[PDB]
Design a protein around this ligand. Structure first.
Ligand SMILES: Cc1ncc(COP(=O)(O)O)c(CN[C@@H](Cc2ccccc2)C(=O)O)c1O
Ligand SMILES: Cc1ncc(COP(=O)(O)O)c(CN[C@@H](Cc2ccccc2)C(=O)O)c1O
Ligand SMILES: [Cl-]
Ligand SMILES: [Cl-]
Ligand SMILES: [Cl-]
Ligand SMILES: [Cl-]
Lengths: 480, 479
């Protein structure tokens, strides 16, 4: 048995602490009892639900054909969720129950699978941890800001990060103070330094996309995670790890093409050992909240994820969920439960190992094309170890119009972006992801630009075409 | 038809400041031939592990009743394949329904639901639209976030839905109660409250106007007209939270033999019988309607929609993009398939079946209140819509009224405890009371009630429960 998490209820917003259960909780205990005719509720009867069953056709472990193989023949199984429990295989969420209102924590069969998944991978190192359902990391992030932040509070964000996360914070009047990165992500020394001289109320938390970081394609090393966790403990702020790309971890990139087949993980044990430690895995104090999603693993349209953290903080999310999103789609949760239990933990691991193999190959093709096509006199690139994104860094100070552009790297970025489009390829300008913010009160007191690309969006031949056109655009702009 | 009023001045400063993604600057290139688009984050439909989803649904015109077993001639299989080429027309193929998409909603679903909205409500200004929600719970949270800043005031029914007040409380939005009688908001007292209003006007009125939770009241056409006039006069919005709209029923009669003759049979009779919505009256575009499938299909869809003027709906979409993102593509693709397989004609058949089922449940409940509750100390308004009935009691006739210091809440508590002892549980009316004051505040009762539902238990158990409730009132009042 592990220690208890620290009491962090002092990091909740005043508004989150004041949230209450329904005044009709005070009759729920009679909802079970026979002898009592319960007329005090509002539940419709499952008798009219016009869904006798739902089915899906899904692929079959171990996905020996690759996870993208046609779903047919031996690679097709039909899962069925009937309305009535008696008509179902074991451990299903029958539609009479999954299509009824229920507990906002989530349906028990789904929570059990996703909790086992979480513990097998992350070995959460305090006793009083839990999982609750979300309708994806988008909602879970909105709900995080509502649970831990009042208007005028500060959070720390990666100095280049996800535009939607900043928009969500902006909408709630929460200041996003940027944390300095290098090509490998957050620099722990500058985060420590920032905190050591912090003026005014401390930030409530750090928001990190620590695996396959959007837009940098960086992943924090186990060593940087340890140091950042120590800073969160020393200055007493939470870490919110928004981790939709956790299972897009890949084999380390090598230029030696011949070495690549040999590098693949060979079984479930090698796979689990290869995964970078999560902040939850490090979280002896219970100050980590993890946002997990099926979006990049199964499909975005599930609108289903979960949140990992200490019981007493997750309870405040459940109160908010009751009067905001209520619960995920019963169809998504019943079908996800059916797929995961049909595959089993073994099959889901096979799926995640297939996902690793496919992304590893996409990344090798992307970075081989960067190495080949992009002029090195004015460019650099960090091969990603995780995620769907790659970046190309350019020394804007080498652009032959840099003086004529008033030494403004963003005018070089705009020129390269326009030239790329003229050459027939589009990447996302890095400056579009820049986070800006000041604490209240504010704290006291660059020639390189980059572009974000994805290797997950298009067929791999069109990827190579694209990046050749991007190399040309950089050669045209820099006169090479 | 005319343009709606410009009501952008009623948006919260926070809502007005919301922006689109900086990555809209490149979406136009996303389709274009000749551009290799690497600027996005869309994972690949090739890997979505769902080749097909199907559902077994009942078959119009639901002649055996909407709860008839879904088997034989009363079983249709709808199928949504991953690939468009594999589907019947007008489906949302899983390659698209399980992909990120417009937060407005998937086009085939929006088209059906907009057709339905106009067919029933005949929206009387040009620039109206519909957007998707994940139910009226979310749409209400989003309404507060779109039209209210902390310390703003909204008007609510004196007795209303606990989750709606909890949502407003979490946002620091004051809920000022509007006086009701057994038929709902009393317009004359709302006009008076507004005529005397000091300080910033309330942003809107929140009304569960059909099958009101918990009163079981439904505003008459006449009251809706009077309330609409007040909303236009003082320039506030009306938010009609209307999950129970299609639980409208035939008017109650004691005369069992009269019931079948006055029941709607036909589509034309059905559309004529429905109470006008506030959107049907909304010549100015100051109404937002929260619509849901929860009480019509099933709560677990987590799918509804919002009706209102385009420029206000665009602000809900900005919010939705960074809050719920979109409904489940399974929910949206399956609802689109069911609704299009039934068609508008089958959907009306379904809503006419729902009307008949609820009409009968209400008839059984009200016949049992009439039979078993002592008339000496009680009254009841038979609902014309919704899932709730109420029993009103004169607490001042309780033999312990003096012993209770003339506190009706002590009579309520005693009747509640006695009901539980006799084996029947209803919800005390006082639990639904709304309290609030504006900033600054506006300048400066013997009846109690209980909420029951006739929609939760089999009708034989309902009559069991109400006879026990009758015994409980008889014991407490000494009759
Ligand atoms: C950092 C980060 N957090 C969350 C998500 C989305 O998670 P979900 O809600 O699906 O569980 C992402 C994914 N980024 C996508 C999302 C998107 C939004 C609108 C249109 C297309 C795609 C992106 O924009 O790159 C994420 O990066
Ligand atoms: C006035 C009102 N508005 C919304 C809803 C729910 O709409 P949805 O989000 O399903 O579209 C209701 C219905 N109320 C239920 C909700 C519930 C909460 C907790 C546990 C069970 C059910 C009720 O309790 O009565 C509504 O009345
Ligand atoms: Cl890295
Ligand atoms: Cl930059
Ligand atoms: Cl009424
Ligand atoms: Cl009362």
């Amino acid at each position: 048995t592990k220690p208890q998490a620290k009491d962090l209820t002092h990091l909740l917003s005043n508004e989150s602490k004041a949230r209450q259960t329904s005044p009709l909780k005070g009759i729920f205990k009679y909802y079970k009892q026979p002898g009592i005719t319960f007329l005090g509720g509002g539940l419709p009867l499952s008798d009219y639900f016009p869904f006798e069953k739902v089915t899906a056709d899904i692929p079959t472990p171990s996905f020996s054909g690759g996870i993208g193989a046609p779903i047919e023949g031996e690679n097709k199984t039909t899962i069925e969720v009937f309305k009535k429990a008696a008509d179902n295989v074991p451990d299903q969420i029958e539609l009479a129950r999954s299509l009824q209102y229920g507990s906002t924590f989530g349906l028990p069969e789904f929570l059990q699978f996703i909790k086992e998944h979480t513990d097998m991978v992350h070995k959460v190192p305090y006793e009083n941890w839990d999982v609750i359902v979300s309708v994806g990391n988008t909602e879970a992030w909105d709900s995080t800001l509502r649970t831990f932040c009042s208007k005028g509070d500060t959070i720390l964000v990666e100095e280049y990060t996800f535009s939607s996360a900043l928009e969500s914070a902006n909408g709630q009047g929460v200041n996003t103070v940027p944390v300095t990165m290098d090509e490998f992500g957050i620099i722990p020394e500058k985060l420590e330094e920032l905190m050591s001289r912090w003026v005014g109320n401390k930030p409530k938390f750090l928001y990190t996309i620590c695996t396959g970081q959007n837009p940098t394609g960086s992943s924090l090393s186990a060593e940087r995670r340890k140091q950042i966790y120590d800073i969160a403990c020393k200055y007493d702020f939470l870490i919110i790890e928004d981790e939709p790309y956790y299972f897009l971890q890949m084999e380390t990139y090598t230029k030696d093409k011949a070495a690549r087949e040999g590098k693949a993980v060979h079984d479930h044990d090698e796979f689990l050992k290869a995964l970078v430690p999560s902040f939850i895995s490090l979280d002896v104090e219970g100050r980590v909240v993890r946002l997990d999603s099926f979006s990049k693993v199964l499909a975005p349209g599930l609108r289903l994820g979960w949140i990992v953290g200490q019981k007493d903080l997750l309870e405040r999310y459940v109160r908010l969920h009751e009067v905001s999103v209520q619960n995920p789609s019963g169809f998504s949760e019943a079908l996800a439960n059916a797929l995961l239990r049909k595959w089993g933990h073994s099959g889901y691991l096979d799926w995640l190992i297939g996902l690793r193999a496919e992304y590893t190959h996409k990344r090798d093709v992307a970075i081989d094309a960067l190495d080949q096509f992009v002029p090195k006199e004015v460019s650099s690139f960090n091969p990603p170890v995780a995620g769907m994104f790659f970046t190309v860094t350019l020394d804007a100070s080498k652009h032959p119009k840099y003086k004529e552009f008033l030494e403004d790297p963003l005018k070089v970025e705009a020129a390269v972006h326009e030239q790329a489009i003229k050459q027939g390829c589009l990447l996302a300008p890095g400056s579009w992801f820049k986070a800006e913010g000041q604490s209240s009160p504010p704290q006291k007191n660059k020639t390189h630009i980059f572009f974000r690309g994805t290797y997950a969006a298009v067929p791999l031949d069109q990827l190579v075409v694209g990046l050749e056109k991007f190399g040309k655009a950089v050669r045209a702009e820099f006169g090479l």
